[PDB]
């Protein structure tokens, strides 16, 4: 349009530069100096300029915390294959044993596909930043009648989250937090600089607080974040480890009955910021690749965790996510799953099993179509079942593996659709069998302390319903190193998780469920081949038969009833319950597996159900028969076995 | 006699659907140009629900009240209600009774009947930009934090405390004689 | 000369900037039309931030001397205080 010659005194020297416009605008298809010129307001006098200055909140000083950032993305393996996310097609990659990396450039393009306003011209912003429109993504939500809202907007270069609260007077307060590498932070309006705003500064990264003095004073009444800790963690954690940290907190918060009635305290508000960061960190890590490629395994881990985070927050708070979802990677993951047998995943190296599970989660988003992944998860659980030692509280590794697989299971349980009932039922049965008293103990400890043993537990998806506070406490850890109040609280948390009022406890995937007249009287459900057994305290159930177990005078009734082929009868069988025949003429040593497919349980005459097991293989049968499980010296404990013939037998002894 | 049984197996499932490689980015992500979301809070003004007011007679069921002090009976409505809900909830529950705001004298009495977990809705409200009052009139000290008319008390409350949400469910403080 | 601040972008043909020493800390810019020349007294602080933003926004399209300019402008900008104006006579050049 009109080239401008600019002259400027540089240490006494009257130097000048020429400023072309179209030569650059032609190269930068979104830059319009005219609009910025209007915003520049070069006609602004000193008074109004200073008025803006006095309005904006100033940070007292900067923490100056030194730290080092880890390397999330590893060097490209020599034998890896190169994947172009924009050119994904049926060939090039087949099998899970082939290393590969996906080019960052097209990945970034997909993750930040959407374009819009990053920095709006509103009351707290128009006085700080110049208008910015660019490729971006965001996480956002609103709570408390939408009196309070938060937007976790971010770019591939920097993050900026906004906290907004509106009073009943219509008055509002707004505070924003800017985070990213110092060298590439968004342009400030007028004579302002980041060193006056920055609260934390590291080698590359800094955290900047953007608000007004009046609003700041308001926020501080309830929202007082630990900037030191938050800032450091935001840099020193890896994308995967960071996301896991965030997720665990969210899960524990929700599970204890948190976001049911959201509280506008620091804890929750801080959490929102951390969630926003988790998404940024991944997108950032991709941008920070020098236009190279990223190992698929790394991507699987990073996206898996965000995917889960998305699914959970979208329920707990009802938050939504826009962007950070690459169709290219999803298609590739789906392709990989299509080259393997779901049923046989349990026979793969543990390392590969996790890989496959993560890929599956991403490849088939929201488990909306390919339900076959459930069979996959079951294969994995079953193989684990056959390796896991009797009644032991799993293992760190097992927990991680199962945790990953459990996600697709949880997705299926959100819809009352009877797809692969039999597989889902098995999954729950196996999970139930693994939920020993030791597991309850280990979990409660983990909950009290906030460890991975509280985060994930197969018990959560079990078909055991007779658990209450008193029982869980009796099974609680007995250590002087624990806060006994915290433990009792952990119990309430645990009970909450299993509440019948919780969506994933509905268990409507089980046809037999219909036979239940009183859910509140159900003690346990055991779905076996050609028969589901219901254990309850209610005489009335639409079963094919009815048995009553021996117990003490003051004990709750113990009713057992099979449902043949999961078909409900017209009502309870008239007359008194049957008794169970006893077996004494049986040896501990057996030629082969004769109980495979059968269930084995035991109970205390006073306390009720104590253990559950399920015979899946010879090794399992051997382990149990060779163990001292069958304590025939304990006259208060009885052992029952349930067959696929819809019958039950009691064990009197073993040679 | 017993018969050997086969190992437990997972039920076979269908093969995965094919990948639609003909779905373009435009289809994967429609409407490339987007705008950040916003919400508009619903605002309304609280006014005294003149349908109900301070009861004007004596009454007390000696086995229904939670605690007593001086000449009054104090109740904690068991059913959990919203702050607004308390006004009607008590009026429609007992003979002469009403939603009551704790005094500097009485508040200590009720706080000693509360644990550190529960939170009790109280009959204290803003009239104008201030002059926090109750059905008994008078002026109350309120811990003004949030721009809302509702207040509550708890074990560690020295005054009625403001709160960001009135829609949460809590026991109601009401009295009789 | 120093002036008191109190117009389409395309209407400017030349821009003149000065040091902090010239106008006793008051960062001022002089704008002018293209003969026939009409000058305008402009807020130097705003003018500088304007150009810095443009150069960063178009960083991918800059040439050697433009990157040098960016550094120069940022340097000058960083060296220009604001707070000192609380003591200065804001109408000094009025």
């Amino acid at each position, epitope marked *: 349009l009109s080239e401008v010659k600019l002259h400027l005194d540089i240490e006494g020297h009257a130097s000048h530069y020429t400023i072309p416009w179209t030569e650059l605008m032609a190269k930068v298809p979104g830059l319009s100096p005219e609009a910025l010129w209007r915003e520049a307001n070069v006609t602004e006098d000193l008074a109004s300029m200073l008025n803006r200055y006095k309005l904006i909140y100033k940070t007292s000083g900067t923490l100056g915390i030194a730290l080092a950032e880890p390397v999330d993305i590893p060097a490209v393996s020599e034998g890896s294959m190169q994947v172009d996310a924009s050119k994904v097609h049926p060939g090039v990659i087949s099998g899970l044993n082939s290393p590969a990396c996906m080019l960052s450039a097209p990945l970034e393009k997909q993750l930040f596909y959407y374009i819009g306003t990053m920095l709006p011209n509103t009351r707290p912003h128009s006085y700080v930043f110049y208008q910015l429109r660019c490729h971006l993504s965001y996480v956002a939500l609103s709570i408390n009648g939408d009196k309070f809202q938060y937007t976790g907007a971010m770019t591939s270069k920097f993050l900026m989250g906004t906290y907004k609260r509106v009073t009943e007077k219509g008055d509002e307060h707004v505070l924003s937090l800017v985070f990213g590498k110092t060298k590439d932070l968004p342009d400030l309006r007028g004579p302002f600089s980041y060193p006056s705003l920055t609260s934390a500064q590291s080698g590359d990264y800094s955290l900047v607080i953007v608000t007004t003095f*009046v609003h700041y004073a308001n926020f*501080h009444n309830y929202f007082v974040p630990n900037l030191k800790d938050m800032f450091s963690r935001a840099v020193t954690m890896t994308a995967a480890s960071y996301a896991r940290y965030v997720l665990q907190k969210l899960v524990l918060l929700e599970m204890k009955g948190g976001c049911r009635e959201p509280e506008l305290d620091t804890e929750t508000l801080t959490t929102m910021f951390e969630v926003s960061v988790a998404f940024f960190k991944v997108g950032h890590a991709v941008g920070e690749t020098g236009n190279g490629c990223v190992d698929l395994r790394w991507l699987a881990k990073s996206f898996f965790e965000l995917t889960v985070l998305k699914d959970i927050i979208g329920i707990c708070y009802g938050a939504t996510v826009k962007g950070m979802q690459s169709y290219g990677l999803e298609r590739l993951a789906a392709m990989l799953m299509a080259t393997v047998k779901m049923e046989e995943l349990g026979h793969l190296t543990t390392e590969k099993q996790e890989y496959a599970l993560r890929l599956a989660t991403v490849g088939y988003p929201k488990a909306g179509v390919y339900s076959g992944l459930i069979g996959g998860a079951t294969s994995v659980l079953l193989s684990a079942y056959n390796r896991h030692p009797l009644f032991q509280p799993l293992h760190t590794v097992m927990r991680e593996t199962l945790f990953i697989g459990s996600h697709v299971v949880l997705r299926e349980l959100r819809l009352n659709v009877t797809t692969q009932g039999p597989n889902l039922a098995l999954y729950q049965l196996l999970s139930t069998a693994l939920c020993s008293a030791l597991e309850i103990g280990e979990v409660l400890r983990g909950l009290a302390l906030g460890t991975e043993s509280g985060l994930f537990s197969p018990c959560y998806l079990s078909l055991r319903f007779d658990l209450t506070r008193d029982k869980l406490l009796s099974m609680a850890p007995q250590e002087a190193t624990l806060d006994q109040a915290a433990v009792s609280y952990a119990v309430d948390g645990f009970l909450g998780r299993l509440s019948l009022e919780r969506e994933d406890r509905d268990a409507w995937h089980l046809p037999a469920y219909k036979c239940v007249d009183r859910l509140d009287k159900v003690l346990m459900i055991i779905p076996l081949i050609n028969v589901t057994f219901i254990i309850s305290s209610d005489r009335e159930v639409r079963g094919s038969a009815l048995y009553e177990a021996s117990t003490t005078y003051l004990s709750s009734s113990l009713f057992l009833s099979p449902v043949i082929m999961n078909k409900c009868s017209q009502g309870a069988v008239a007359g008194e319950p049957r008794q169970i025949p006893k077996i004494q003429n049986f040896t501990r040593t057996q030629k082969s597996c004769i109980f495979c497919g059968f269930a084995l349980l035991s109970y205390d005459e006073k306390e009720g159900l104590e253990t559950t097991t399920y015979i899946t293989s010879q090794e399992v049968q051997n382990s149990i028969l060779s163990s001292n499980y069958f304590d025939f010296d304990n006259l208060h404990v009885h052992y029952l076995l349930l067959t696929t013939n819809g019958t039950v037998m009691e064990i009197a002894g073993l040679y | 006699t017993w018969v050997p049984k086969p190992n437990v197996e997972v039920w076979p499932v269908d093969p995965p659907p094919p990948v639609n490689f003909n779905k373009t980015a435009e289809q994967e992500y429609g409407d490339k140009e987007v705008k950040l979301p916003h919400w508009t809070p619903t605002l309304h003004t609280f006014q005294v629900p003149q349908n109900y007011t301070k009861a004007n007679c004596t009454y007390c069921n000696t086995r229904e009240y939670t605690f007593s002090y001086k000449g009054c009976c104090f109740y904690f409505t068991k059913k959990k209600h919203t702050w607004n809900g308390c006004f009607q909830a008590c009026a429609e529950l007992y003979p002469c009774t009403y939603f009551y705001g704790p005094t500097p004298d009485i508040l200590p009495v009720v706080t000693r009947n509360l644990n550190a977990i529960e939170s009790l809705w109280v009959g204290v409200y803003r009239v104008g930009e201030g002059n926090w009052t109750s059905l008994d009139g008078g002026t109350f000290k309120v811990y003004q934090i949030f721009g809302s008319h509702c207040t509550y008390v708890s074990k560690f409350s020295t005054v009625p405390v403001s709160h960001h949400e009135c829609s949460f469910l809590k026991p109601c403080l009401c009295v009789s004689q | 000369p120093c002036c008191h601040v109190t117009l389409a972008l395309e209407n400017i043909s030349d821009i003149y900037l000065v040091s902090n020493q010239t106008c006793d800390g008051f960062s001022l810019a002089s704008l002018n039309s293209p003969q026939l020349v009409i000058s305008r007294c402009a807020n130097g602080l705003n003018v500088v931030s304007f150009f810095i933003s443009i150069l960063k926004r178009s960083s991918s399209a800059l040439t050697g001397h433009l990157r040098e300019l960016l550094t120069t402008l940022e340097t000058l900008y960083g060296s220009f205080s604001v707070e000192d104006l609380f003591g200065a006579n804001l109408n000094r050049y009025a």
Partner: antibody
Framework: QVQLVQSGADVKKPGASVKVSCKAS????????ISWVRQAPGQGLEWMGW????????NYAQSLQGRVTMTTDTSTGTAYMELRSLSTDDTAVYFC????????????????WGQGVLVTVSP | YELTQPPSVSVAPGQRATITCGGH??????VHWYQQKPGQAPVLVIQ???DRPSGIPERFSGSNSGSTATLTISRVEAGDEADYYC?????????????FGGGTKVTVLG
């Protein structure tokens, strides 16, 4: 609510020393700083100093520096301020106030004030 | 930085009682106003140039520009008789402090 309770009021003589105690209540002590101000009878308000209740950072009036000390007891939420080498001209009412923040390039107003204490100095 | 305030003022009831404070570039600073009655601690009424907290009647206002800051009480009442002070924050050239002006005694006739 927000409360500040002040005590330690007394009558001293020139050369003596006094320590004023201000007790916080109703809020997290460490979340807000504390300001001190003096007011002699018939006079205006003289800023004395400010203390960071969390970090121990202090800012003193130049006219007091060398004869003034501030400190807090975190576990009780109690602030203390000591004056030394007292003079008759130091007869005044002393106040504490809740001071959110202060620093080299910023500071807030004082929303809440304590009752104050009267300190008299006379030979 | 020393602030300038008048000794005292006394006005008719119901009038737009107006109090001013002088200072170099005072408009560039955040001015706070405090009210004090005998036997009582000073109370913040207006902060940051016309921002008022809850508890302050809507008849209280004010502003700040150039060399003059101002506070105004609409329909001044006898109960508004009190001393008022202007306060600013000062960077102190490395020794940051707060400064109060002389203060003004404000009364109402009747």
């Amino acid at each position: 609510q927000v409360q500040l309770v002040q005590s330690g009021a007394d009558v001293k003589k020139p050369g003596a020393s006094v320590k004023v105690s201000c007790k916080a209540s109703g809020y997290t002590f460490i979340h807000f700083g504390i300001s001190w101000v003096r007011q002699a009878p018939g006079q205006g308000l003289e800023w004395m100093g400010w203390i960071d209740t969390n970090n121990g950072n202090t800012n003193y009036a130049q006219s007091l520096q060398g004869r003034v000390t501030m400190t807090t007891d975190t576990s009780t939420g109690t602030a203390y301020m000591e004056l030394r080498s007292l003079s008759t001209d130091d007869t005044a009412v002393y106040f504490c106030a809740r001071a959110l923040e202060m620093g080299h390039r910023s500071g807030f107003p004082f929303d809440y004030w304590g009752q104050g204490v009267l300190v008299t100095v006379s030979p | 930085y020393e602030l300038t305030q008048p000794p005292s003022v006394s006005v008719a009831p119901g009038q737009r009682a107006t109090i001013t404070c002088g200072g170099h570039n005072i408009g560039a600073k955040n001015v706070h106003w405090y009210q004090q009655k005998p036997g009582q601690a000073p109370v913040l009424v207006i902060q940051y140039d016309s921002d008022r907290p809850s508890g302050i009647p809507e008849r209280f206002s004010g502003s700040n520009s150039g060399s003059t800051a101002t506070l105004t009480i609409s329909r001044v009442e006898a109960g508004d008789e009190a001393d008022y002070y202007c306060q600013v924050w000062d960077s102190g050239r490395g020794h940051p402090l707060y400064v109060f002006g002389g203060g003004t005694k404000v009364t109402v006739l009747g």
